[PDB]
């Protein structure tokens, strides 16, 4: 029913549990977005990427 | 200077729970008791009245 | 009876939030023992705070202070 | 005419309340007037820092209102918040979506 | 009759709206944040009390709080907090 | 839906993905709400509880049990089990300084 | 008519005249006594120890 | 010139009270000084928090007695409360 | 007039050995509360003195059993780690140059 | 083999001395510190207080690791065990 | 001079610390990770001691600055004072 708006990612996450395509802690693999990052996370990455 | 002296003979042990003469004092509650049914009674008292009876004789609790 | 109020499926639910795949049949009652001694250690400190405060309803503050002292703190109960 | 210390510091948080607490919290006999400015700015910053992640967590988890889940998500993903909040727990906060990979079916 | 009860409510709500204007917050989540704000204040000011004794000082002071926050905060969270505390002192000391 | 009856010891993962996601408290309120009184009354009789105090206890205690179980998961995986077994809890509770 | 004490000695302590304190038990009650000198010079003389059962003619 | 404010003579007097044959190496005196100072900071810190939680200006014998009741373990708490109440009992006369 | 010559200490009036006046001095200058009770430092001194008596008695037993009578950090560590009550009071602390309590696991012992 | 290792355990648990050499550890302290600040000085006792805390931390780590290894029945130890001990005591993740 | 003086932690010292911890056999994988774990502990204690020293404006670290680091890290030490 209408619960598909919250169930579909779990339905995909079970399909990926069969396929074994999960990430290093068992999530569905996803695009990283740097617009979500704080100035401190940007600084931690700046200090790592050298 | 009118306060009377401290007593010259030692104080009797009257039992705390009944006033009858106390041949005994309990290692746990430190009260004075006279009979076996008084020992059976004092081990059923709450700590509050035990320290109450002790304080009533300026003994080892406040 | 009261300690068995930690239900056999509640042990499974809690361990499944804890990520574990499978439970051995002996886990349950000794885990109630662990929950019991943890509850007891926090509740007795909370009562110790409540008695100094003269009150005799155990407050959310009495248990927050016990948990804060024991380094098992929580937020959301007005710390 | 009068105005708050917060307005001069550029702070939202009430600097006078912080100075009143720095007295009454039994920390020392005296308190420098810039100490609550610096400390309120740190409190306000730590609050802005965590709630920026909470707002992004709420938005990504498809909700308009921040709830204890979005706080736990903000707290446990950033290791410096997680390491600061190591000895504390969150009212109804749950935990991260994280699976021990050895437990997957093979 | 009951007294007024102390919490940072409009100030944490203003701190939310200045970074996520679109977003609301629950009374539970506000209670978690108000608890956290008071707890971190107590850690910083409690450690500051020891730093004061270690230096025989009578005054809790921004120069000394700048040591207590870098002791308590892990990693770069210290560096950003020390910067913003310095920016707040910069705005205030420009006027007094 | 589609995996249905797939591999016993894997509806376990269907359970992890329910309880890890959700805000619920997994012990029933009423049994626990009596048990906290029974634990308290041995030290001082005739105690009441704030209706928030029992919830603060439950939420701290379920978090303590959940953290213990996840540490116990590492104790099982370290010994190459996916079944938690009593000795796993004994290791965790000793190393965290709770039993020694 | 004779006054007789009769019990298990639960614990017994002696200082350095002497003062000491002695505890006695039956299957039904427990007691502590501050001892007088002429008991100390008997309990020590007869090497009494905790867990003994002892009967004492109090007059002697 | 400079000072340290140690408990040294008091802990040594207590040693000779419990065991008249026994003595202290200054390295063990360093343990005892560290210990009694730390337990003082623990109890006074607990009592301070407890008084502030109860919105008092004062710590008194009941604040400290409760702070000790929190800090100490099993039989040592029972004996510590026993000696704390004995001392206040024989002081208040 | 003038104040009392050889005025009796709070400690010796209480029957204590620890410096009750210093306990009050340090409670007040240590900033723990803005006011402090007169019997508060008596109680605190008596607890610190009791803990001191107990820990040193167990250390002196450890020294006696070790064929010694000068306490060294070793005897205190042996006392503190033999007694479960001191051990659980003292879990977050190291006794400097006291070493560790000697212990072999049952799996490492012979046969 | 393996009998004299039990006699080593008995000997080092009877003794109370520093197990790391003073001069190498004294350099290690200074060599780490020189990028937390330029040109640190150290009081003579400070290097010893550092070394005592570090050796006590390491003895406690090996004690907790012993319980990890013997839980896994293996009498020999590997990083496989230490990475439980840190993760479960709480210094990591 | 300056160097990676964690290799001043001689292998017999690691064996002795392990043998004092009662572990009987010590694999070749232990030693260099254990050097890392020791170094990581020193880094925090030194970071903190350096900051207690910065309030005092000192270059000279005392046993107190480390005892205070050990207090904030909850691994307190008796014998040096504090």
PDB file of N, CA and C in Angstrom, chain F residues 5-90:
ATOM      1  N   UNK F   5      11.050 -17.141   2.995  1.00  0.00           N
ATOM      2  CA  UNK F   5      11.590 -18.122   3.961  1.00  0.00           C
ATOM      3  C   UNK F   5      13.123 -18.309   3.906  1.00  0.00           C
ATOM      4  N   UNK F   6      13.837 -17.461   3.162  1.00  0.00           N
ATOM      5  CA  UNK F   6      15.287 -17.516   2.906  1.00  0.00           C
ATOM      6  C   UNK F   6      16.152 -17.756   4.163  1.00  0.00           C
ATOM      7  N   UNK F   7      16.930 -18.854   4.151  1.00  0.00           N
ATOM      8  CA  UNK F   7      18.031 -19.217   5.074  1.00  0.00           C
ATOM      9  C   UNK F   7      17.790 -18.888   6.565  1.00  0.00           C
ATOM     10  N   UNK F   8      17.274 -19.824   7.391  1.00  0.00           N
ATOM     11  CA  UNK F   8      17.182 -19.665   8.846  1.00  0.00           C
ATOM     12  C   UNK F   8      18.447 -19.074   9.486  1.00  0.00           C
ATOM     13  N   UNK F   9      18.273 -18.078  10.355  1.00  0.00           N
ATOM     14  CA  UNK F   9      19.334 -17.160  10.768  1.00  0.00           C
ATOM     15  C   UNK F   9      19.471 -15.932   9.852  1.00  0.00           C
ATOM     16  N   UNK F  10      18.403 -15.535   9.145  1.00  0.00           N
ATOM     17  CA  UNK F  10      18.370 -14.356   8.243  1.00  0.00           C
ATOM     18  C   UNK F  10      17.083 -13.537   8.377  1.00  0.00           C
ATOM     19  N   UNK F  11      15.970 -14.119   8.836  1.00  0.00           N
ATOM     20  CA  UNK F  11      14.857 -13.320   9.385  1.00  0.00           C
ATOM     21  C   UNK F  11      15.311 -12.611  10.674  1.00  0.00           C
ATOM     22  N   UNK F  12      16.380 -13.106  11.305  1.00  0.00           N
ATOM     23  CA  UNK F  12      17.182 -12.363  12.269  1.00  0.00           C
ATOM     24  C   UNK F  12      17.617 -10.977  11.753  1.00  0.00           C
ATOM     25  N   UNK F  13      18.127 -10.872  10.516  1.00  0.00           N
ATOM     26  CA  UNK F  13      18.533  -9.595   9.900  1.00  0.00           C
ATOM     27  C   UNK F  13      17.327  -8.713   9.564  1.00  0.00           C
ATOM     28  N   UNK F  14      16.204  -9.323   9.171  1.00  0.00           N
ATOM     29  CA  UNK F  14      14.907  -8.638   9.037  1.00  0.00           C
ATOM     30  C   UNK F  14      14.447  -8.030  10.372  1.00  0.00           C
ATOM     31  N   UNK F  15      14.712  -8.706  11.487  1.00  0.00           N
ATOM     32  CA  UNK F  15      14.534  -8.153  12.832  1.00  0.00           C
ATOM     33  C   UNK F  15      15.539  -7.037  13.175  1.00  0.00           C
ATOM     34  N   UNK F  16      16.847  -7.180  12.893  1.00  0.00           N
ATOM     35  CA  UNK F  16      17.823  -6.097  13.156  1.00  0.00           C
ATOM     36  C   UNK F  16      17.358  -4.796  12.491  1.00  0.00           C
ATOM     37  N   UNK F  17      16.968  -4.875  11.218  1.00  0.00           N
ATOM     38  CA  UNK F  17      16.555  -3.722  10.405  1.00  0.00           C
ATOM     39  C   UNK F  17      15.227  -3.090  10.849  1.00  0.00           C
ATOM     40  N   UNK F  18      14.413  -3.782  11.658  1.00  0.00           N
ATOM     41  CA  UNK F  18      13.269  -3.196  12.382  1.00  0.00           C
ATOM     42  C   UNK F  18      13.715  -2.468  13.657  1.00  0.00           C
ATOM     43  N   UNK F  19      14.428  -3.155  14.548  1.00  0.00           N
ATOM     44  CA  UNK F  19      14.708  -2.624  15.891  1.00  0.00           C
ATOM     45  C   UNK F  19      15.844  -1.596  15.927  1.00  0.00           C
ATOM     46  N   UNK F  20      16.785  -1.659  14.986  1.00  0.00           N
ATOM     47  CA  UNK F  20      17.854  -0.670  14.854  1.00  0.00           C
ATOM     48  C   UNK F  20      17.326   0.688  14.349  1.00  0.00           C
ATOM     49  N   UNK F  21      16.311   0.658  13.474  1.00  0.00           N
ATOM     50  CA  UNK F  21      15.660   1.830  12.858  1.00  0.00           C
ATOM     51  C   UNK F  21      14.778   2.625  13.838  1.00  0.00           C
ATOM     52  N   UNK F  22      13.989   1.910  14.639  1.00  0.00           N
ATOM     53  CA  UNK F  22      12.842   2.439  15.397  1.00  0.00           C
ATOM     54  C   UNK F  22      13.186   2.970  16.799  1.00  0.00           C
ATOM     55  N   UNK F  23      12.342   3.865  17.328  1.00  0.00           N
ATOM     56  CA  UNK F  23      12.489   4.530  18.645  1.00  0.00           C
ATOM     57  C   UNK F  23      11.921   3.742  19.837  1.00  0.00           C
ATOM     58  N   UNK F  24      11.270   2.596  19.618  1.00  0.00           N
ATOM     59  CA  UNK F  24      10.517   1.881  20.664  1.00  0.00           C
ATOM     60  C   UNK F  24      11.408   1.441  21.845  1.00  0.00           C
ATOM     61  N   UNK F  25      10.820   1.248  23.031  1.00  0.00           N
ATOM     62  CA  UNK F  25      11.466   0.554  24.148  1.00  0.00           C
ATOM     63  C   UNK F  25      10.942  -0.890  24.212  1.00  0.00           C
ATOM     64  N   UNK F  26      11.852  -1.854  24.160  1.00  0.00           N
ATOM     65  CA  UNK F  26      11.589  -3.241  23.772  1.00  0.00           C
ATOM     66  C   UNK F  26      11.131  -4.127  24.942  1.00  0.00           C
ATOM     67  N   UNK F  27      11.308  -3.681  26.188  1.00  0.00           N
ATOM     68  CA  UNK F  27      10.639  -4.251  27.365  1.00  0.00           C
ATOM     69  C   UNK F  27       9.228  -3.633  27.489  1.00  0.00           C
ATOM     70  N   UNK F  28       8.206  -4.441  27.788  1.00  0.00           N
ATOM     71  CA  UNK F  28       6.846  -3.941  28.066  1.00  0.00           C
ATOM     72  C   UNK F  28       6.854  -2.993  29.280  1.00  0.00           C
ATOM     73  N   UNK F  29       6.133  -1.866  29.232  1.00  0.00           N
ATOM     74  CA  UNK F  29       6.179  -0.839  30.291  1.00  0.00           C
ATOM     75  C   UNK F  29       5.740  -1.384  31.649  1.00  0.00           C
ATOM     76  N   UNK F  30       4.556  -1.987  31.745  1.00  0.00           N
ATOM     77  CA  UNK F  30       3.945  -2.344  33.032  1.00  0.00           C
ATOM     78  C   UNK F  30       4.789  -3.333  33.864  1.00  0.00           C
ATOM     79  N   UNK F  31       5.271  -4.471  33.325  1.00  0.00           N
ATOM     80  CA  UNK F  31       6.128  -5.391  34.075  1.00  0.00           C
ATOM     81  C   UNK F  31       7.380  -4.719  34.648  1.00  0.00           C
ATOM     82  N   UNK F  32       8.075  -3.923  33.833  1.00  0.00           N
ATOM     83  CA  UNK F  32       9.236  -3.148  34.263  1.00  0.00           C
ATOM     84  C   UNK F  32       8.852  -2.096  35.312  1.00  0.00           C
ATOM     85  N   UNK F  33       7.742  -1.386  35.100  1.00  0.00           N
ATOM     86  CA  UNK F  33       7.235  -0.349  35.999  1.00  0.00           C
ATOM     87  C   UNK F  33       6.858  -0.890  37.385  1.00  0.00           C
ATOM     88  N   UNK F  34       6.506  -2.175  37.509  1.00  0.00           N
ATOM     89  CA  UNK F  34       6.437  -2.854  38.812  1.00  0.00           C
ATOM     90  C   UNK F  34       7.824  -3.246  39.322  1.00  0.00           C
ATOM     91  N   UNK F  35       8.641  -3.893  38.490  1.00  0.00           N
ATOM     92  CA  UNK F  35       9.960  -4.411  38.872  1.00  0.00           C
ATOM     93  C   UNK F  35      10.893  -3.342  39.467  1.00  0.00           C
ATOM     94  N   UNK F  36      10.913  -2.120  38.926  1.00  0.00           N
ATOM     95  CA  UNK F  36      11.722  -1.027  39.501  1.00  0.00           C
ATOM     96  C   UNK F  36      11.338  -0.723  40.953  1.00  0.00           C
ATOM     97  N   UNK F  37      10.053  -0.849  41.304  1.00  0.00           N
ATOM     98  CA  UNK F  37       9.567  -0.651  42.674  1.00  0.00           C
ATOM     99  C   UNK F  37      10.059  -1.762  43.579  1.00  0.00           C
ATOM    100  N   UNK F  38       9.966  -3.005  43.115  1.00  0.00           N
ATOM    101  CA  UNK F  38      10.466  -4.165  43.854  1.00  0.00           C
ATOM    102  C   UNK F  38      11.972  -4.055  44.114  1.00  0.00           C
ATOM    103  N   UNK F  39      12.745  -3.577  43.137  1.00  0.00           N
ATOM    104  CA  UNK F  39      14.181  -3.335  43.303  1.00  0.00           C
ATOM    105  C   UNK F  39      14.439  -2.214  44.323  1.00  0.00           C
ATOM    106  N   UNK F  40      13.668  -1.126  44.290  1.00  0.00           N
ATOM    107  CA  UNK F  40      13.837  -0.001  45.211  1.00  0.00           C
ATOM    108  C   UNK F  40      13.467  -0.328  46.672  1.00  0.00           C
ATOM    109  N   UNK F  41      12.343  -1.018  46.900  1.00  0.00           N
ATOM    110  CA  UNK F  41      11.731  -1.105  48.233  1.00  0.00           C
ATOM    111  C   UNK F  41      12.558  -1.863  49.292  1.00  0.00           C
ATOM    112  N   UNK F  42      13.501  -2.723  48.891  1.00  0.00           N
ATOM    113  CA  UNK F  42      14.402  -3.432  49.819  1.00  0.00           C
ATOM    114  C   UNK F  42      15.268  -2.473  50.658  1.00  0.00           C
ATOM    115  N   UNK F  43      15.651  -1.334  50.079  1.00  0.00           N
ATOM    116  CA  UNK F  43      16.524  -0.334  50.701  1.00  0.00           C
ATOM    117  C   UNK F  43      15.741   0.743  51.465  1.00  0.00           C
ATOM    118  N   UNK F  44      14.542   1.086  50.984  1.00  0.00           N
ATOM    119  CA  UNK F  44      13.596   1.998  51.636  1.00  0.00           C
ATOM    120  C   UNK F  44      12.176   1.644  51.198  1.00  0.00           C
ATOM    121  N   UNK F  45      11.340   1.197  52.130  1.00  0.00           N
ATOM    122  CA  UNK F  45       9.937   0.864  51.841  1.00  0.00           C
ATOM    123  C   UNK F  45       9.096   2.111  51.526  1.00  0.00           C
ATOM    124  N   UNK F  46       7.942   1.903  50.892  1.00  0.00           N
ATOM    125  CA  UNK F  46       6.890   2.908  50.664  1.00  0.00           C
ATOM    126  C   UNK F  46       7.265   4.035  49.676  1.00  0.00           C
ATOM    127  N   UNK F  47       8.258   3.801  48.811  1.00  0.00           N
ATOM    128  CA  UNK F  47       8.658   4.734  47.751  1.00  0.00           C
ATOM    129  C   UNK F  47       7.609   4.843  46.639  1.00  0.00           C
ATOM    130  N   UNK F  48       7.439   6.060  46.122  1.00  0.00           N
ATOM    131  CA  UNK F  48       6.758   6.334  44.850  1.00  0.00           C
ATOM    132  C   UNK F  48       7.776   6.512  43.724  1.00  0.00           C
ATOM    133  N   UNK F  49       7.313   6.623  42.485  1.00  0.00           N
ATOM    134  CA  UNK F  49       8.132   7.007  41.330  1.00  0.00           C
ATOM    135  C   UNK F  49       7.455   8.130  40.550  1.00  0.00           C
ATOM    136  N   UNK F  50       8.212   9.133  40.102  1.00  0.00           N
ATOM    137  CA  UNK F  50       7.724   9.985  39.022  1.00  0.00           C
ATOM    138  C   UNK F  50       7.489   9.139  37.771  1.00  0.00           C
ATOM    139  N   UNK F  51       6.443   9.454  37.016  1.00  0.00           N
ATOM    140  CA  UNK F  51       6.122   8.739  35.775  1.00  0.00           C
ATOM    141  C   UNK F  51       7.216   8.902  34.704  1.00  0.00           C
ATOM    142  N   UNK F  52       8.037   9.950  34.786  1.00  0.00           N
ATOM    143  CA  UNK F  52       9.257  10.123  33.990  1.00  0.00           C
ATOM    144  C   UNK F  52      10.460   9.330  34.524  1.00  0.00           C
ATOM    145  N   UNK F  53      10.573   9.104  35.837  1.00  0.00           N
ATOM    146  CA  UNK F  53      11.722   8.418  36.428  1.00  0.00           C
ATOM    147  C   UNK F  53      11.825   6.964  35.963  1.00  0.00           C
ATOM    148  N   UNK F  54      10.702   6.246  35.955  1.00  0.00           N
ATOM    149  CA  UNK F  54      10.641   4.876  35.429  1.00  0.00           C
ATOM    150  C   UNK F  54      11.035   4.828  33.950  1.00  0.00           C
ATOM    151  N   UNK F  55      10.653   5.827  33.153  1.00  0.00           N
ATOM    152  CA  UNK F  55      11.060   5.895  31.750  1.00  0.00           C
ATOM    153  C   UNK F  55      12.557   6.196  31.617  1.00  0.00           C
ATOM    154  N   UNK F  56      13.102   7.111  32.424  1.00  0.00           N
ATOM    155  CA  UNK F  56      14.534   7.387  32.433  1.00  0.00           C
ATOM    156  C   UNK F  56      15.351   6.134  32.784  1.00  0.00           C
ATOM    157  N   UNK F  57      14.924   5.387  33.809  1.00  0.00           N
ATOM    158  CA  UNK F  57      15.495   4.083  34.132  1.00  0.00           C
ATOM    159  C   UNK F  57      15.402   3.138  32.935  1.00  0.00           C
ATOM    160  N   UNK F  58      14.218   2.945  32.348  1.00  0.00           N
ATOM    161  CA  UNK F  58      14.064   2.015  31.230  1.00  0.00           C
ATOM    162  C   UNK F  58      14.983   2.377  30.063  1.00  0.00           C
ATOM    163  N   UNK F  59      15.042   3.648  29.681  1.00  0.00           N
ATOM    164  CA  UNK F  59      15.807   4.083  28.517  1.00  0.00           C
ATOM    165  C   UNK F  59      17.318   3.968  28.738  1.00  0.00           C
ATOM    166  N   UNK F  60      17.814   4.305  29.930  1.00  0.00           N
ATOM    167  CA  UNK F  60      19.209   4.065  30.286  1.00  0.00           C
ATOM    168  C   UNK F  60      19.537   2.564  30.355  1.00  0.00           C
ATOM    169  N   UNK F  61      18.652   1.755  30.937  1.00  0.00           N
ATOM    170  CA  UNK F  61      18.882   0.324  31.100  1.00  0.00           C
ATOM    171  C   UNK F  61      18.806  -0.426  29.775  1.00  0.00           C
ATOM    172  N   UNK F  62      17.831  -0.131  28.919  1.00  0.00           N
ATOM    173  CA  UNK F  62      17.791  -0.730  27.590  1.00  0.00           C
ATOM    174  C   UNK F  62      19.001  -0.303  26.757  1.00  0.00           C
ATOM    175  N   UNK F  63      19.450   0.957  26.837  1.00  0.00           N
ATOM    176  CA  UNK F  63      20.689   1.370  26.180  1.00  0.00           C
ATOM    177  C   UNK F  63      21.913   0.614  26.731  1.00  0.00           C
ATOM    178  N   UNK F  64      21.999   0.421  28.050  1.00  0.00           N
ATOM    179  CA  UNK F  64      23.063  -0.362  28.674  1.00  0.00           C
ATOM    180  C   UNK F  64      23.049  -1.823  28.192  1.00  0.00           C
ATOM    181  N   UNK F  65      21.879  -2.464  28.136  1.00  0.00           N
ATOM    182  CA  UNK F  65      21.729  -3.823  27.612  1.00  0.00           C
ATOM    183  C   UNK F  65      22.075  -3.891  26.120  1.00  0.00           C
ATOM    184  N   UNK F  66      21.594  -2.957  25.300  1.00  0.00           N
ATOM    185  CA  UNK F  66      21.905  -2.898  23.862  1.00  0.00           C
ATOM    186  C   UNK F  66      23.405  -2.749  23.623  1.00  0.00           C
ATOM    187  N   UNK F  67      24.069  -1.836  24.336  1.00  0.00           N
ATOM    188  CA  UNK F  67      25.516  -1.659  24.230  1.00  0.00           C
ATOM    189  C   UNK F  67      26.275  -2.914  24.666  1.00  0.00           C
ATOM    190  N   UNK F  68      25.870  -3.520  25.788  1.00  0.00           N
ATOM    191  CA  UNK F  68      26.413  -4.796  26.245  1.00  0.00           C
ATOM    192  C   UNK F  68      26.229  -5.891  25.191  1.00  0.00           C
ATOM    193  N   UNK F  69      25.040  -6.030  24.599  1.00  0.00           N
ATOM    194  CA  UNK F  69      24.798  -7.019  23.555  1.00  0.00           C
ATOM    195  C   UNK F  69      25.679  -6.777  22.333  1.00  0.00           C
ATOM    196  N   UNK F  70      25.862  -5.536  21.889  1.00  0.00           N
ATOM    197  CA  UNK F  70      26.688  -5.253  20.712  1.00  0.00           C
ATOM    198  C   UNK F  70      28.180  -5.524  20.997  1.00  0.00           C
ATOM    199  N   UNK F  71      28.659  -5.198  22.199  1.00  0.00           N
ATOM    200  CA  UNK F  71      29.982  -5.622  22.669  1.00  0.00           C
ATOM    201  C   UNK F  71      30.086  -7.158  22.778  1.00  0.00           C
ATOM    202  N   UNK F  72      29.015  -7.821  23.208  1.00  0.00           N
ATOM    203  CA  UNK F  72      28.919  -9.285  23.262  1.00  0.00           C
ATOM    204  C   UNK F  72      28.895  -9.891  21.852  1.00  0.00           C
ATOM    205  N   UNK F  73      28.374  -9.177  20.850  1.00  0.00           N
ATOM    206  CA  UNK F  73      28.422  -9.581  19.449  1.00  0.00           C
ATOM    207  C   UNK F  73      29.879  -9.679  18.975  1.00  0.00           C
ATOM    208  N   UNK F  74      30.691  -8.669  19.297  1.00  0.00           N
ATOM    209  CA  UNK F  74      32.132  -8.709  19.063  1.00  0.00           C
ATOM    210  C   UNK F  74      32.801  -9.855  19.839  1.00  0.00           C
ATOM    211  N   UNK F  75      32.395 -10.138  21.078  1.00  0.00           N
ATOM    212  CA  UNK F  75      32.913 -11.289  21.826  1.00  0.00           C
ATOM    213  C   UNK F  75      32.625 -12.636  21.138  1.00  0.00           C
ATOM    214  N   UNK F  76      31.429 -12.815  20.573  1.00  0.00           N
ATOM    215  CA  UNK F  76      31.086 -14.007  19.802  1.00  0.00           C
ATOM    216  C   UNK F  76      31.882 -14.078  18.487  1.00  0.00           C
ATOM    217  N   UNK F  77      31.913 -12.988  17.710  1.00  0.00           N
ATOM    218  CA  UNK F  77      32.626 -12.911  16.422  1.00  0.00           C
ATOM    219  C   UNK F  77      34.133 -13.146  16.606  1.00  0.00           C
ATOM    220  N   UNK F  78      34.718 -12.627  17.684  1.00  0.00           N
ATOM    221  CA  UNK F  78      36.112 -12.865  18.044  1.00  0.00           C
ATOM    222  C   UNK F  78      36.392 -14.358  18.275  1.00  0.00           C
ATOM    223  N   UNK F  79      35.496 -15.059  18.976  1.00  0.00           N
ATOM    224  CA  UNK F  79      35.530 -16.513  19.146  1.00  0.00           C
ATOM    225  C   UNK F  79      34.961 -17.305  17.947  1.00  0.00           C
ATOM    226  N   UNK F  80      34.669 -16.636  16.822  1.00  0.00           N
ATOM    227  CA  UNK F  80      34.111 -17.217  15.586  1.00  0.00           C
ATOM    228  C   UNK F  80      32.785 -17.955  15.796  1.00  0.00           C
ATOM    229  N   UNK F  81      31.880 -17.302  16.526  1.00  0.00           N
ATOM    230  CA  UNK F  81      30.449 -17.616  16.631  1.00  0.00           C
ATOM    231  C   UNK F  81      29.602 -16.428  16.182  1.00  0.00           C
ATOM    232  N   UNK F  82      28.430 -16.702  15.618  1.00  0.00           N
ATOM    233  CA  UNK F  82      27.358 -15.706  15.406  1.00  0.00           C
ATOM    234  C   UNK F  82      26.247 -15.837  16.459  1.00  0.00           C
ATOM    235  N   UNK F  83      26.259 -16.938  17.211  1.00  0.00           N
ATOM    236  CA  UNK F  83      25.476 -17.158  18.426  1.00  0.00           C
ATOM    237  C   UNK F  83      26.180 -16.522  19.622  1.00  0.00           C
ATOM    238  N   UNK F  84      25.526 -15.607  20.341  1.00  0.00           N
ATOM    239  CA  UNK F  84      26.022 -15.185  21.659  1.00  0.00           C
ATOM    240  C   UNK F  84      25.755 -16.279  22.698  1.00  0.00           C
ATOM    241  N   UNK F  85      26.728 -16.517  23.572  1.00  0.00           N
ATOM    242  CA  UNK F  85      26.711 -17.580  24.586  1.00  0.00           C
ATOM    243  C   UNK F  85      27.281 -17.029  25.906  1.00  0.00           C
ATOM    244  N   UNK F  86      26.893 -17.543  27.090  1.00  0.00           N
ATOM    245  CA  UNK F  86      27.116 -16.853  28.367  1.00  0.00           C
ATOM    246  C   UNK F  86      28.527 -16.290  28.584  1.00  0.00           C
ATOM    247  N   UNK F  87      29.575 -17.057  28.265  1.00  0.00           N
ATOM    248  CA  UNK F  87      30.984 -16.641  28.403  1.00  0.00           C
ATOM    249  C   UNK F  87      31.352 -15.342  27.667  1.00  0.00           C
ATOM    250  N   UNK F  88      30.636 -14.989  26.602  1.00  0.00           N
ATOM    251  CA  UNK F  88      30.805 -13.713  25.898  1.00  0.00           C
ATOM    252  C   UNK F  88      30.476 -12.520  26.804  1.00  0.00           C
ATOM    253  N   UNK F  89      29.385 -12.625  27.568  1.00  0.00           N
ATOM    254  CA  UNK F  89      28.953 -11.587  28.508  1.00  0.00           C
ATOM    255  C   UNK F  89      29.967 -11.486  29.650  1.00  0.00           C
ATOM    256  N   UNK F  90      30.466 -12.625  30.140  1.00  0.00           N
ATOM    257  CA  UNK F  90      31.466 -12.651  31.207  1.00  0.00           C
ATOM    258  C   UNK F  90      32.743 -11.900  30.817  1.00  0.00           C
TER     259      UNK F  90
END
